[PDB]
Amino acid sequence: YMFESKSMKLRTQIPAEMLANIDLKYFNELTKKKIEKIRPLLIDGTASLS
Amino acid sequence: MDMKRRIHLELRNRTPAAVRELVLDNCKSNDGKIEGLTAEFVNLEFLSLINVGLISVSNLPKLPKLKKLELSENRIFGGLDMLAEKLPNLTHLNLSGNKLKDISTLEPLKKLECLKSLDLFNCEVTNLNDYRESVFKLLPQLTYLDGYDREDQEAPDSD
Amino acid sequence: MDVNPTLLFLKVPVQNAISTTFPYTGDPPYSHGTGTGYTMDTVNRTHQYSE
Amino acid sequence: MERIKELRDLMSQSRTREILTKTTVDHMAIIKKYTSGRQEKNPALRMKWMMAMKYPITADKRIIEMIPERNEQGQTLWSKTNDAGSDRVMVSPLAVTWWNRNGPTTSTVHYPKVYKTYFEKVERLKHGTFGPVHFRNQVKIRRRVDTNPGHADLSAKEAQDVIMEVVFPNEVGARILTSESQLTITKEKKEELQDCKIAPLMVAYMLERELVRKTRFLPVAGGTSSVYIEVLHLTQGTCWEQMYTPGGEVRNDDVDQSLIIAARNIVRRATVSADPLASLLEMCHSTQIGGIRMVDILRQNPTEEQAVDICKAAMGLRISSSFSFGGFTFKRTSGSSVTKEEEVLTGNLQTLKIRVHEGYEEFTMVGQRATAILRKATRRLIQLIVSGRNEQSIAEAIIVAMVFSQEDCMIKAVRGDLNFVNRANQRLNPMHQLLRHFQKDAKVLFQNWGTEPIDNVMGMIGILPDMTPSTEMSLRGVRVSKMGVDEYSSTERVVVSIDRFLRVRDQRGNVLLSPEEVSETQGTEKLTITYSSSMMWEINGPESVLVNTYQWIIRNWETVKIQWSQDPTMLYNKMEFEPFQSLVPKAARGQYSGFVRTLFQQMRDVLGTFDTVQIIKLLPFAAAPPKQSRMQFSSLTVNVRGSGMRILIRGNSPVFNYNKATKRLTVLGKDAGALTELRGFLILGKEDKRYGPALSINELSNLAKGEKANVLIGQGDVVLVMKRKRDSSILTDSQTATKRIRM
Amino acid sequence: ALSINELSNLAKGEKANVLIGQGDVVLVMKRKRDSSI
C-alpha cells in the first residue's frame, strides 16, 4: 500500500509483508475489513489459497 | 444615462429626420425594451444597440431605411418576428452573445427579403451539429453566416 | 441536431453494428485491477464462498 | 467660529503673538517639535500598572452623549477627570467593549480599499500553496531585496504630491497647480476615496505606505521576489525550507527595460552626433517612455544599467561607484588603481593595448546568480572566493574574475584572433574582446592556471579545472566557498565626470562604464518610446516609425485640423511625414496620396463628413507628389520588416485600430494614445483687491481660459493666479535659448 | 509580396507582388473588367 499525508506532504509505502502487524488505523474501512479477514491466513508473508 | 437621455445626447440638436447613423450602446433599457426612439426617425440606416440590457425588441420603432442593425451582448431570447415587419430593408443583423437556443427561434427571419449577413457568435444555438447548414437552409437568402459564405471563405471587405 | 450514435441502432440490428459498442482496439493506457487490495479481496472472496 | 476665538485669545496675550507672527509658515514644523513632558521609560510596566487602576484610557468629550455612565450592571464606563490638561475625559476599558457591542453601527466599504496594503496580504496568503519541508543544510546569503509588493514604483517625494492631491485637495501647493503632471494613480484614488470619512491623516499614511518601496538587506536563501520576502519567516529557516508560493499578483518590471532600451538608443544617436550633450539633454527632456517624460522616469527609478547610468550622469545625477562588468557589479572595498594603458602580445602573437590596472584592490563581485570576493594586485590574482547556485554560475563568476584578473596568462593563452565586433560593428575594448573570446571555453586557460593543494580549512570545497568539486586540489586562488558569500549593503553613490566620448571616468581616473560594453542586446521594448524629433523615428524600425507618426499627429490634432481645413498644401508637405513615406511602396506613394488628397477635399466640400479618425489614419499618405488615377483603393500598403501590412480606409486593421467605447488608439499592438473623436495655472503676484476676496483651490475650477483670480495657494499665502495660454513647457524651446549661446 | 489570401483585398486596377508558387514571386494586376461564364 501507499500512504499519503496531505498535511505534511509525505508519500510513504508499506510492503505487503508488514500487513501482519501494522496497526489497522491508516486504512479505510473496506481495506481494514479485508486485512482483518485475511490476517488469520497469513504465513511467511503469503496467504493460503487452498 | 438611459436611452432617452443619450438619444438626445446623440441627437446633437439635429432633427431625427436628418440622422443616418445612430449609435446607442451600453446605455440602458427601461426594463427590457427599447424606449426613447420614435417613428420620426426616417433617415436612419445604422442603429447599434450593443450591450444595452435588452430582454426583447417588442417596442422597436419603424425604420424603413434601416440596413445595419446589431443587438450583440444583449439577452434577447426570442420575439424576432417584429424585426421583419418593422425593418423590411434590414440587410445586416448581428445577434451575437444573446440567449438564442434553437433554430426555431430564427424562423421569423426567413421572411426578410434582403438579408446578407447574420452574426450569431457565442449563442447556445451555435453548439449544434450541422449548425451552419441548418441556418443556411432555414434562411436561403443568407450569403454570409458568422462571417463566411458557404465554403468557409471570409466575406469580402467593403460591405 | 444533437448527434446520438447509439440511435443508429434504430435502423440496423445491434449484431450488425455491434462493433460500435467495443470502445478500444488495443490495450488501454490504464491498469484496471491489480495490487494488494484486489488480491486480498480475491483471497477473502474465495474463502467466503467456501466458508 | 471657536477656532478664530482661540486665535484671538492667543494673540491677546503679548507673548505668544511673537511666536504667532514672526514664525513664517516655513518655520512651523520646527516649532511643532518643542514638546513637553518626559515621554515614558519602560512603557510595558506603565501599562501593566495602568490597567490595574480604573479609567486608564482617555477619550474625547463625546462619550458623555453617546455612552451611558453605567452599563446594565452598574459599572462606571467613563469618568470626568480631564486627563492632565485637556478636554479628554478618562475612561475605563469597559467602554471599548460597550461600544463594540451596544454601539453605533456603520457600513464599512471604504476599509477594504483604503487598507489595500493589508487585505492584499490576506488574499495573497489565502491562495498560497505549500510544499514539503526540506531539512537540507540551508545557505542564506544576505541580499538586499524589496519588502513592499505593489509599491507602484513611486519615490518618497512624489508620493507626497499624490497624497496632497487625493486627501488634501484644498491645500495643494504651487509646484502642483502650476504643473502638467497629473499622474494616473491620483485620478483613481481620488475617485475611490470620494466619500471616505475614515481619518484624513490615516488615509494619507496608508497611501504613502502603499505607494513607496523599501529594502532591508535580509538573509535570503531563494525567491528574492517582492512577495517572497514578506513570508520569509515561513519559507526559510536555519535548518529547514518550507516550499511556498504567494498566490496574489505580481508587478511587471517592463518600464525599467523600456527605459534601458531608450537610454541605449539615445546615447548611440547622441555620441554619433556633433554635440553629444545637447542631443542627450534634449532627448531626455523630450522623449517619453509610455507617455511619461523620460526625465521623470530617470529621477524616479533606481534601475542600474549602463545606458541608463550614462543618461543619468549626463544629467548631473549621482551614480553608483560600482562598475558593472560581464553582468556582475564590482563594489570596491579597499585599494587604489590606475588604468595605465600598456601593450601586450596575445597567444597568436597579436599586438594589443589594454589598461593594465596597476594597484592592489579588493572587490565584491555581486551578481544575479553568483557572488564572490576578489582581491588582486597588478597582474596578480591574489584571491578569489566564489559562491552561488550550481557549478555553472560558479564557473561564470570564476571566468569573469579571471578575465578581470589583469594576468597576462589569459592573454598568452588565447586561441584565435582577438578581432571581435558588435552589432554596430565597432572596435570593442581589447579586455572586453578577451572577455567574449573566453566566455565560451577556457579549458586551455584552466590548464595554464594549474591546480594547487588546499588544506580543508573550515570546509571549503575546491574547484577543479573541469569545474568539479575537490577537497584537496583546486585552481590557483579560486576557492569555492560553502555557507554562501554575503553581498554588500551599500552602493556608495557618487558624482562622476563624463568625458566627451561616453566614457564615464571619475575624479580618480578609473573608467566605470565604457560606452562599448552596452550593446548586449537590441530587443524590442514592451512599452512605446516616443521621440520629439522626426529623425529619431527611424531608429527602432517600422513599428516605432508608425507609432511615433500617429502619436505626433494625435499630439497636435488642433493644429493639424486647422491647417488641413485652411492651408492643406502646407500640411501635406511637412517633415514629420518623410519617415512614414519611407515605408510606403515607392511605386504607389503618388497614386495613394492623390486618392487621400482628393478624398480629403471631399470632406471640405460637403459638411458633416469631417471624420477625425479617418483623417488621422489617412493623413501620412498625403505627403507625396500626388498623381491622378481612377482607382478607388480599399487598403493602402505599408512595408514593415519586409512584410506588406495593410491599412484599411474604412474600418480597423492591425496597423491601426481606434477602439470605440474608449478614446485609445493602437498601432501594431503598441499603444499609441488617447484621441478625442485643476492644474495648468500660472502665478502673477500677491493679493490684489481689484479681483475681490480670495478663493479656495476648489473654486478655481470655475474660470475661463484666461480669467485672473486670486486664490489661497497651499498652506497660507494668497497669490493672484491665471489660466495659461499655449502649452508653455520646458521642451526644446528652452534648449534653443541655451544651446544657441553655446556655439 | 502579398500572400495569395491577401490579394483578394486589392481594388480594381491595383498592382502588387504575390508569392504565387514555390519560392517564387510575380507581379499581378487586378482586372478592372470582371469576366464570368
PDB file of C-alpha atoms in Angstrom, chain D residues 143-248:
ATOM      1  CA  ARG D 143      20.678  40.016  -0.289  1.00  0.00           C
ATOM      2  CA  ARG D 144      19.125  43.496  -0.289  1.00  0.00           C
ATOM      3  CA  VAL D 145      15.591  42.931  -1.578  1.00  0.00           C
ATOM      4  CA  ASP D 146      12.309  44.797  -1.889  1.00  0.00           C
ATOM      5  CA  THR D 147       9.913  44.449   1.046  1.00  0.00           C
ATOM      6  CA  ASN D 148       6.773  46.180  -0.232  1.00  0.00           C
ATOM      7  CA  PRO D 149       4.968  44.358  -3.064  1.00  0.00           C
ATOM      8  CA  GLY D 150       2.777  46.540  -5.238  1.00  0.00           C
ATOM      9  CA  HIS D 151       4.649  49.716  -4.301  1.00  0.00           C
ATOM     10  CA  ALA D 152       3.568  51.441  -7.551  1.00  0.00           C
ATOM     11  CA  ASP D 153       7.228  52.392  -8.174  1.00  0.00           C
ATOM     12  CA  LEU D 154       6.941  55.924  -6.820  1.00  0.00           C
ATOM     13  CA  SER D 155       9.658  57.712  -4.877  1.00  0.00           C
ATOM     14  CA  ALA D 156       9.273  59.098  -1.349  1.00  0.00           C
ATOM     15  CA  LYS D 157       8.692  62.666  -2.608  1.00  0.00           C
ATOM     16  CA  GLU D 158       6.191  62.406  -5.474  1.00  0.00           C
ATOM     17  CA  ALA D 159       4.112  60.161  -3.236  1.00  0.00           C
ATOM     18  CA  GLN D 160       3.667  63.255  -1.064  1.00  0.00           C
ATOM     19  CA  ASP D 161       2.406  65.169  -4.098  1.00  0.00           C
ATOM     20  CA  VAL D 162      -0.086  62.353  -4.710  1.00  0.00           C
ATOM     21  CA  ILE D 163      -1.284  62.416  -1.093  1.00  0.00           C
ATOM     22  CA  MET D 164      -1.700  66.190  -1.059  1.00  0.00           C
ATOM     23  CA  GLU D 165      -3.822  65.878  -4.207  1.00  0.00           C
ATOM     24  CA  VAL D 166      -6.052  62.971  -3.082  1.00  0.00           C
ATOM     25  CA  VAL D 167      -6.648  63.685   0.628  1.00  0.00           C
ATOM     26  CA  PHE D 168      -5.972  67.447   0.838  1.00  0.00           C
ATOM     27  CA  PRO D 169      -7.175  68.948  -2.457  1.00  0.00           C
ATOM     28  CA  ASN D 170      -7.632  72.421  -0.930  1.00  0.00           C
ATOM     29  CA  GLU D 171      -4.051  72.576   0.403  1.00  0.00           C
ATOM     30  CA  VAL D 172      -2.208  71.762  -2.825  1.00  0.00           C
ATOM     31  CA  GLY D 173       0.856  73.914  -3.448  1.00  0.00           C
ATOM     32  CA  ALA D 174       2.201  75.979  -6.313  1.00  0.00           C
ATOM     33  CA  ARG D 175       4.505  73.209  -7.533  1.00  0.00           C
ATOM     34  CA  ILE D 176       1.434  71.081  -8.343  1.00  0.00           C
ATOM     35  CA  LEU D 177      -1.168  73.512  -9.695  1.00  0.00           C
ATOM     36  CA  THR D 178       1.338  75.251 -11.983  1.00  0.00           C
ATOM     37  CA  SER D 179       2.329  71.904 -13.493  1.00  0.00           C
ATOM     38  CA  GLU D 180       1.140  69.410 -16.098  1.00  0.00           C
ATOM     39  CA  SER D 181       1.867  66.081 -14.352  1.00  0.00           C
ATOM     40  CA  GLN D 182      -1.494  64.747 -13.173  1.00  0.00           C
ATOM     41  CA  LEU D 183      -0.390  61.098 -12.882  1.00  0.00           C
ATOM     42  CA  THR D 184      -2.885  58.254 -13.287  1.00  0.00           C
ATOM     43  CA  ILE D 185      -2.941  56.966  -9.700  1.00  0.00           C
ATOM     44  CA  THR D 186      -4.075  60.373  -8.449  1.00  0.00           C
ATOM     45  CA  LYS D 187      -7.161  60.083 -10.662  1.00  0.00           C
ATOM     46  CA  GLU D 188      -8.013  56.561  -9.491  1.00  0.00           C
ATOM     47  CA  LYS D 189      -7.560  57.195  -5.769  1.00  0.00           C
ATOM     48  CA  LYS D 190      -9.437  60.494  -5.976  1.00  0.00           C
ATOM     49  CA  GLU D 191     -12.380  58.551  -7.409  1.00  0.00           C
ATOM     50  CA  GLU D 192     -12.173  55.652  -4.944  1.00  0.00           C
ATOM     51  CA  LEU D 193     -11.741  57.780  -1.809  1.00  0.00           C
ATOM     52  CA  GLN D 194     -14.556  60.135  -2.798  1.00  0.00           C
ATOM     53  CA  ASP D 195     -16.617  59.897   0.414  1.00  0.00           C
ATOM     54  CA  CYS D 196     -14.247  58.279   2.924  1.00  0.00           C
ATOM     55  CA  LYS D 197     -14.829  59.508   6.474  1.00  0.00           C
ATOM     56  CA  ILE D 198     -12.080  57.369   7.965  1.00  0.00           C
ATOM     57  CA  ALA D 199      -9.217  59.573   9.126  1.00  0.00           C
ATOM     58  CA  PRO D 200      -7.668  62.007   6.594  1.00  0.00           C
ATOM     59  CA  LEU D 201      -4.292  61.611   8.286  1.00  0.00           C
ATOM     60  CA  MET D 202      -4.704  57.827   8.396  1.00  0.00           C
ATOM     61  CA  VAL D 203      -5.742  57.782   4.738  1.00  0.00           C
ATOM     62  CA  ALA D 204      -2.585  59.722   3.902  1.00  0.00           C
ATOM     63  CA  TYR D 205      -0.418  57.348   5.934  1.00  0.00           C
ATOM     64  CA  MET D 206      -1.911  54.273   4.280  1.00  0.00           C
ATOM     65  CA  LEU D 207      -1.485  55.782   0.822  1.00  0.00           C
ATOM     66  CA  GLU D 208       2.180  56.603   1.432  1.00  0.00           C
ATOM     67  CA  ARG D 209       2.692  53.119   2.884  1.00  0.00           C
ATOM     68  CA  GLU D 210       1.201  51.558  -0.250  1.00  0.00           C
ATOM     69  CA  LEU D 211       2.924  53.883  -2.759  1.00  0.00           C
ATOM     70  CA  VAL D 212       6.567  53.525  -1.652  1.00  0.00           C
ATOM     71  CA  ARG D 213       9.289  50.883  -1.903  1.00  0.00           C
ATOM     72  CA  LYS D 214      11.733  49.796   0.792  1.00  0.00           C
ATOM     73  CA  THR D 215      14.684  47.430   1.154  1.00  0.00           C
ATOM     74  CA  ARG D 216      16.072  45.660   4.203  1.00  0.00           C
ATOM     75  CA  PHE D 217      19.278  43.685   3.420  1.00  0.00           C
ATOM     76  CA  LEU D 218      17.903  40.388   4.668  1.00  0.00           C
ATOM     77  CA  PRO D 219      19.351  36.849   4.878  1.00  0.00           C
ATOM     78  CA  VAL D 220      17.541  35.481   1.848  1.00  0.00           C
ATOM     79  CA  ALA D 221      18.050  31.930   0.575  1.00  0.00           C
ATOM     80  CA  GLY D 222      15.945  31.932  -2.591  1.00  0.00           C
ATOM     81  CA  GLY D 223      12.990  33.598  -4.235  1.00  0.00           C
ATOM     82  CA  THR D 224      14.233  37.180  -3.939  1.00  0.00           C
ATOM     83  CA  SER D 225      10.909  38.466  -5.279  1.00  0.00           C
ATOM     84  CA  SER D 226       8.951  41.290  -3.677  1.00  0.00           C
ATOM     85  CA  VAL D 227       6.279  38.871  -2.413  1.00  0.00           C
ATOM     86  CA  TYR D 228       8.551  36.052  -1.186  1.00  0.00           C
ATOM     87  CA  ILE D 229      10.236  38.365   1.346  1.00  0.00           C
ATOM     88  CA  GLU D 230       7.146  39.136   3.433  1.00  0.00           C
ATOM     89  CA  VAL D 231       6.754  35.399   4.125  1.00  0.00           C
ATOM     90  CA  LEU D 232      10.463  34.893   4.753  1.00  0.00           C
ATOM     91  CA  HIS D 233       9.721  33.749   8.307  1.00  0.00           C
ATOM     92  CA  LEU D 234       7.524  30.986   6.850  1.00  0.00           C
ATOM     93  CA  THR D 235       9.592  29.831   3.870  1.00  0.00           C
ATOM     94  CA  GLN D 236      13.151  29.500   5.196  1.00  0.00           C
ATOM     95  CA  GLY D 237      14.807  28.610   8.483  1.00  0.00           C
ATOM     96  CA  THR D 238      18.195  27.866   9.980  1.00  0.00           C
ATOM     97  CA  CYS D 239      17.865  24.185   9.031  1.00  0.00           C
ATOM     98  CA  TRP D 240      14.604  23.890   7.055  1.00  0.00           C
ATOM     99  CA  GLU D 241      12.969  25.212   3.901  1.00  0.00           C
ATOM    100  CA  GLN D 242       9.173  25.152   3.636  1.00  0.00           C
ATOM    101  CA  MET D 243       8.476  25.482  -0.076  1.00  0.00           C
ATOM    102  CA  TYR D 244       5.793  28.127  -0.525  1.00  0.00           C
ATOM    103  CA  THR D 245       4.134  30.331  -3.148  1.00  0.00           C
ATOM    104  CA  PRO D 246       2.147  33.546  -2.618  1.00  0.00           C
ATOM    105  CA  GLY D 247      -0.996  33.446  -4.724  1.00  0.00           C
ATOM    106  CA  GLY D 248      -1.744  37.101  -5.402  1.00  0.00           C
TER     107      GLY D 248
END
